[PDB]
Design a protein around this ligand. Structure first.
Ligand code: 11R
Ligand code: 11R
Ligand SMILES: [Cu+2]
Ligand SMILES: [Cu+2]
Ligand code: NA
Ligand code: NA
Lengths: 620, 620
């Protein structure tokens, strides 16, 4: 019955049928994006209307459309033709991945480049890479992918070991034409293999790891109802999935006594971008918006038990649309489990003689996606004590280049002749806040040092200050780790028993934000990534920090456009957008397959509860 | 046979016998500190000499002594009388804890203060609190403790709920005299109880938590030999224990192929301080050096299976000296276990068709200590991929005060009338580095932004810079989170296969450092805490960032004195001292017993290995 239930195969097939019936999904049409829309504010009273949003591409060269369908009512709500030169190209289609290599394989310029390097065209893989927006006027309004080449010596070879530097091509994937082939000169193609399952490289596998068995003999402590509604240790939420954002959490709330208290209305990773810091023209255009351009949900892995997710696991298998509107299941695409998390609280008291220890646990909701060379795990955690956390785990194979003779200020060496250009992985978490309901505000809290003097004669005092962000113009904030800066989301109309507004505190990792020059294309297209925290007034059409159409789309949309409205955010329905990222100078240890590295953030209750919320946790 | 083995009960009894025989341990003498000394540099060649360092207090008022004993040879190596007014008082003795309350109970001034507040003296607990160094000239050369009062309504009551504000006393614990009683006025003693095992407060305990069973059917993957030598997944180390520092790691090394490669010679938490930020004269003197003044090892908890440490646990039970030189075992005082740590590396490749997933694990070595109201867990982690991490877990009961009518800039409210003064918990990790041996250097590495222009026409480039710290005068460094600042310890004489010096990178959390005014007593006594990173040239007598005797000791010793020597640290035997801490503005959720919060740091290999060190980890 829940309006927040996952899309079913039947709903997707029904959208297909509605579009077909309406004349919007003939044989030349392809679905580039399809997802369920969230219910409107105050929709709980009215009967449900399951609506789906669809981006439809046309392979014959006609203009694409944005369409909203009511699957409940069997109707098209709206359909509008898109001018992609203005509003952006549609996301990259899975079917376009192969096209770059295929077209290049019979292009005389490409073949000349490969022949100059004595490379067999049958062995040359070409990555289908998003193009961005640079100086090439002919690309405006065209669906372009750029191609970088990697040699695969045999079918099971890791092509990433053998980058073909000095060469890049640009391809129109609709007209099926190669627009440009740029050859700046030959570089040696690195020869060492990077085959991490080859015994020659691994050596004898370890026999020293004894089994770790994690079981729950009475099953898990969480329940799943309605397909995706989770209840666990006072927490209540719905686990959604979208082909763009991946796992999306809805209606995160905590049962405090008799009252179900909302905390976050919607939590997602609304964008992620990988900007590269190598000024070589072969890669200086490289910025992968894995979420906005590629759709990370689409490439979610099927996760194997005892391998990807360990313990007593409950899986969800979300359904997405293929290019033709047929449903496709991602079997075991979402993992859900609880795990022990060490000591929760402990005290051994010298006066009362009471010794007290309690254990912590967390609920984990995760997926793993693969975007070419990269593989990312997205993990949401709920803890017994009210803490909410997100963690991204970055692994896969590093994106490679040649390592220049005489070194580089922008590339590190991984193996003889093999380079890894410097880059960042920068995430935007969109948190549609609902601290005890929708009337919320944000304060920036800094530690305040105090001078020795009257009122502080020993020079020991310290304090803090809170500054309310009253309007969107004042709500674009930067980190200040030195002053312990955090941001508190509170409800000014809901007080705890000590007469203080209830709140949650966001604790950032204070990693560097976007490093690119502020006048670059990427600083404009990923403007969100230049600042740690943004707060907007909620609006139904302000979904992504980069806007709806990121592919080959200049600045003009997204967060900078939203905040120009300068709306009241002091005790209103607000959205926090937190930028956080990893700055990666690849190390030799990252090669030939990279150990996981992490980044994230958390929010902790801050006078939300009237005392510790875990006094009722039992011993042992 | 290992010279790094834990002290045995026999060794401690033998030190006692040697001291007795030498005339140094008569009936008026008490042992305030006893610990084994590490072997001298280059001692491996010579036969072993187990030496012990002892601080001996005299209850009759005579001067204390510092003594070094050779237990192997049955000799006193050295014995020197200490002038405590100059070099500092000895650590607080466990037997002195009760003395403050006992002396105050018959003092007319104290009784008058309690009577003004209608408090039964039999119900008033007095915390035995370190005194520091302030304006009281009579305290110089005397062993003083200060007393703050807390009412205990009945034997099992949590006295922390009932602070008696406006009152503090100072006591000479040797002459057994009350030197001062200060009463600045009555405050209401908060009345609500804080009894976290009382059903009235907890309510009905949860019945929703289903068991999590963690077992190892073939036992653990680590071995313990020689009592405390651990081998686990290529790692080699010795687990030491000292009554001051607690768990100390020695000889951390990694077996890379056939070669045992040193990484860290000695790792410890060499100090921890809890400075309070309330300018009230009742607490403005409050700074607890839990390590230096109280000795955190002494109060290590006995850790219960399935409660404190979960899984297949191997315990060590370290032996310490009581006040008379008799051995006392801390049963199950150190936990050792390995645990699963999620995904280690993962890639699903679109060209090779190979799908690869490997799991991570970490070895955990921990203890938990209790210092009055506070309880801290100290955790060291070794990971499969070469990462070394420390984490402190802070819990217990928050130190309380009255909450002032009309609020406070330096105290938060926890319950009606109940306050928690702001404070920090600041740790110093002393890492005696040995990256591939002892010839090491430290570089500070910052991200470098680049301007759009020639050589960077698209404004995408970014880089980094490394600055070698050549001498101790240049080696007192601060965090810069905005520029992604880290510190690399390398061996300039040991290169990896790419001809780059092998190294490890220290990743700090960049939390605020000491907030007190730089002219305060605490800024001088805890000078280490004002800066994030210090590097010294190794010396056998430079053990603690605060010197050997912290109790009632002014500035003059410790790190500022060590670095004045301005020694060469560029390719030498060096020591890194990392300051890291928690700044605590207590929340209502911290009351009546606080959920764990954490802080720490890690070091990751940085061109130490010739490729990923975990290619030989098997599937599943
Ligand atoms: C942004 N950026 C930097 C970047 C950089 C590069 C690329 C890029 O683009 C974005 C790419 C995003 C997509 C990434 C998701 C991961 C894709 C993985 C490939 C999908 C796939 C597609 C096809 N196949 Ru098959 N196969 C066998 C074992 C394991 C497999 C894993 C995956 C297979 C696959 C397997 N197969 C079936 C039977 C016998 C042999 C084989 C082989 C041999 C060698 C390779 C693959 N397979 N297969 C081959 C031919 C036809 C059909 C077929 C099938 C059908 C169903 C299942 C498996 N295979 C972006
Ligand atoms: C820096 N700062 C802010 C600060 C602030 C405040 C203080 C402070 O000082 C530093 C203090 C550092 C020391 C902290 C370490 C923790 C000390 C814990 C107290 C030790 C202790 C000391 C004594 N006893 Ru008992 N006892 C029973 C159960 C559980 C117990 C736990 C601990 C017991 C204890 C227990 N006992 C035995 C038999 C019957 C009843 C009892 C009771 C009842 C009520 C309380 C305690 N006990 N006991 C009582 C009397 C005589 C002997 C005795 C023993 C002997 C052996 C074991 C247990 N007990 C510093
Ligand atoms: Cu990376
Ligand atoms: Cu604290
Ligand atoms: Na909101
Ligand atoms: Na060293």
């Amino acid at each position: 019955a829940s309006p927040f239930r996952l899309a079913s195969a039947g709903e997707i097939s029904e959208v297909q049928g509605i579009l077909r019936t309406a004349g919007l999904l003939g044989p030349e049409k392809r679905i580039a994006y399809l997802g369920v829309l969230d219910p409107a504010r105050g929709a709980g009273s009215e009967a449900e209307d399951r609506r789906f949003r669809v981006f439809i591409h046309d392979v014959s060269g006609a203009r694409p459309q944005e369409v909203t369908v009511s699957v409940t009512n069997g109707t098209v709500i709206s359909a509008v033709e898109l001018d992609t030169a203005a509003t952006g190209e549609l996301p990259v289609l899975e079917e376009e991945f192969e096209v770059v290599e295929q077209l290049l394989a019979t292009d005389e310029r490409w073949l000349k480049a490969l022949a100059a390097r004595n490379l067999d065209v049958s062995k040359v893989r070409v990555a289908p890479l998003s193009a961005g927006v640079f100086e090439y006027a002919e690309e405006r309004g065209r669906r372009i992918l750029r191609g970088l080449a990697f040699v695969q010596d045999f079918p099971e070879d890791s092509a990433w070991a053998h980058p073909v530097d000095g060469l890049v091509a640009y391809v129109d994937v609709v007209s099926k034409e190669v627009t440009r082939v740029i050859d700046t000169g030959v570089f040696p193609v690195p020869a060492e293999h990077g085959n991490y399952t080859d015994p020659e490289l691994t050596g004898p596998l370890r026999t020293t790891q004894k089994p770790i068995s994690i079981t729950q003999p009475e099953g898990p402590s969480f329940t799943v109802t309605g397909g995706n509604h989770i209840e666990w240790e006072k927490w209540s939420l719905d686990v959604g999935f979208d082909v763009r954002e991946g796992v999306v959490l809805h209606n995160i709330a905590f049962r405090d006594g008799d009252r179900l208290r909302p905390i976050i209305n919607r939590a997602s990773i609304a964008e992620m971008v990988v900007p590269y810091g190598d000024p070589s023209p072969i890669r200086s255009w490289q910025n992968y918006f894995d979420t906005g351009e590629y759709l990370v949900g689409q490439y979610a892995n099927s996760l194997e038990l005892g391998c990807d997710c360990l313990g007593d696991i409950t899986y969800l298998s979300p359904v997405i649309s293929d290019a033709f509107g047929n449903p496709r299941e991602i079997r075991n695409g979402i993992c859900m489990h609880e795990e022990d998390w060490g000591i929760l609280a402990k005290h051994s008291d010298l006066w009362s003689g009471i010794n007290y220890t309690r254990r912590n646990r967390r609920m984990v909701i995760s997926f793993f996606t693969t975007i070419g060379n990269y593989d990312y795990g997205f993990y949401w955690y709920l803890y017994l004590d009210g803490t909410i956390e997100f963690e991204a785990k970055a692994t896969g194979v590093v994106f490679t280049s040649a390592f220049p003779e005489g070194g580089s200020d922008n590339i590190s060496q991984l193996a003889p002749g093999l380079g890894a250009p410097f880059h960042q992985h920068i995430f935007s978490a969109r948190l549609d806040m609902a601290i005890d309901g929708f009337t919320n505000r944000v304060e920036e809290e800094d530690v305040v040092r105090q001078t020795m003097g009257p009122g502080n004669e020993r020079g020991n005092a310290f304090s803090r200050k809170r500054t309310v962000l009253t309007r969107e113009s004042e709500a674009v904030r930067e980190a200040d780790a030195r002053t312990g800066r955090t941001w508190i989301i509170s409800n000014p109309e809901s007080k705890n028993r000590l007469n203080e507004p209830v709140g949650y505190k966001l604790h950032a990792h204070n990693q560097p934000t976007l490093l690119a020059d502020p006048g670059s294309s990427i600083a404009r297209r990923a403007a969100f990534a230049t600042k740690d925290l943004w707060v907007t007034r909620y609006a139904d059409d302000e979904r992504y920090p980069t806007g709806d159409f990121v592919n080959q789309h200049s600045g003009g949309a997204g967060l900078p456009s939203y905040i120009a409205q300068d709306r009241d955010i002091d005790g209103q329905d607000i959205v926090v957008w937190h930028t956080f990222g990893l700055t990666h100078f690849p190390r030799v240890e990252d090669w030939p397959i990279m150990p996981v590295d992490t980044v994230g953030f958390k929010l902790r209750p801050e006078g939300f509860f009237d005392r510790s919320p875990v006094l009722d946790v039992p011993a042992n």
